[PDB]
């Protein structure tokens, strides 16, 4: 059941900088670092359901 | 439910026989994420269900049946044909979505078997060939844009060809 729920999170995490691009929050110079941190946690949320697939 | 075919029974049971290591990491996370945010979302869904309390009934789909077919109404008349044109169009909208259900039945056939796919099922592929062939020869699929008067001519064209073939053979 959690396999379907966590699969869409990888799609959601990558769209979060796009959704919070137009003004949203005041973050200069931190925005390029925000892209790096978003994909890093997107990798972790993609590693778990692949372990479910090997199982 | 009821209208959907669905699987008979779901199998799978935990074995864990070979090695120890750190047990199953997926099953350990399954127990971890069940209380992390799966329990919190279930509690929030229950809180939203409790806050509903009073709800509207809504009498669902309206009936409206028969009202005489276009084949029964002989000779061209605007008062008689109008209700017959609406009856044929309502059936054509339903017959479009009948195919879509059996289309999704074939979608369920592909997933719920996986490995076999073509070798197994046997019923869903047969049911698809029984409906689509009936839809192709009777409900347009060759008679361009939808028209009630054209459908009666299409039905007469199929009947005249069948009668000519049956009398000869």
């Amino acid at each position: 059941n959690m396999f379907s729920s966590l699969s869409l999170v990888t799609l959601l995490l990558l769209t979060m900088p796009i959704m919070m691009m137009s003004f949203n929050t005041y973050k200069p110079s931190n925005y390029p670092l925000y892209v790096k941190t978003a994909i890093s946690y997107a990798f972790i949320t993609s590693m778990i359901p692949t372990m479910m697939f090997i199982h | 439910x009821x209208x959907x075919x669905x699987x008979x029974x779901x199998x799978x049971x935990x074995x864990x026989x070979x090695x120890x290591x750190x047990x199953x990491x997926x099953x350990x996370x399954x127990x971890x994420x069940x209380x992390x945010x799966x329990x919190x979302x279930x509690x929030x869904x229950x809180x939203x269900x409790x806050x509903x309390x009073x709800x509207x009934x809504x009498x669902x789909x309206x009936x409206x049946x028969x009202x005489x077919x276009x084949x029964x109404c002989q000779e061209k008349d605007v008062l008689c044909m109008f209700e017959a044109e609406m009856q044929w169009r309502r059936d054509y909208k339903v017959d479009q979505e009948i195919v879509n259900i059996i289309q999704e039945r074939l979608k369920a056939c592909q997933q719920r078997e996986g490995e076999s796919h073509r070798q197994n099922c046997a019923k869903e592929l047969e049911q698809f060939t029984q409906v689509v062939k009936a839809y192709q020869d009777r409900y347009x699929x060759x008679x361009x844009x939808x028209x009630x008067x054209x459908x009666x001519x299409x039905x007469x064209x199929x009947x005249x060809x069948x009668x000519x073939x049956x009398x000869x053979x």
Binding site: - | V99, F128, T129, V132, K133, Y135, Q136, X141, X142
Partner: protein
């Protein structure tokens, strides 16, 4: 398209009468340049200048339709062969495909079993 080697150090007169003609090239070039230079380096300008070379360039393509082509020669008829020609070409392509298809529907069925479209 160039036929032999790339033309840059090939085929030129060795400092003959062409030198007087080559000096004339810079004379007309600077004449159009100096009037451009005078209408550029002033702060009180504000606005894109005309340049008659580009105005006549647009006029050569957009206009000159009926002042030109008043001698309708055999070359225009050859251009007409590339005009009407391709339109009549597909008439023996689409009809041959249709008569192939329509005959297959009636005699010796070639229609798809799962064709709910159209």
């Amino acid at each position: 398209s160039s036929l032999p080697t790339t033309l840059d150090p090939a085929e030129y007169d060795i400092s003959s009468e062409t030198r007087k003609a080559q000096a004339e090239r810079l004379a007309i070039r600077s004449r159009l340049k100096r009037e451009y230079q005078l209408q550029y380096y002033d702060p009180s300008r504000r606005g894109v200048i005309e340049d008659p070379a580009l105005v006549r360039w647009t006029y050569a393509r957009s206009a000159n339709i009926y002042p030109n082509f008043r001698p309708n020669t055999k070359t225009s008829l050859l251009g007409a062969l590339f005009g009407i020609g391709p339109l009549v070409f597909w008439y023996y392509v689409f009809k041959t495909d249709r008569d192939r298809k329509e005959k297959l529907i009636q005699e010796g069925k070639l229609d798809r079993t799962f064709n709910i479209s159209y």
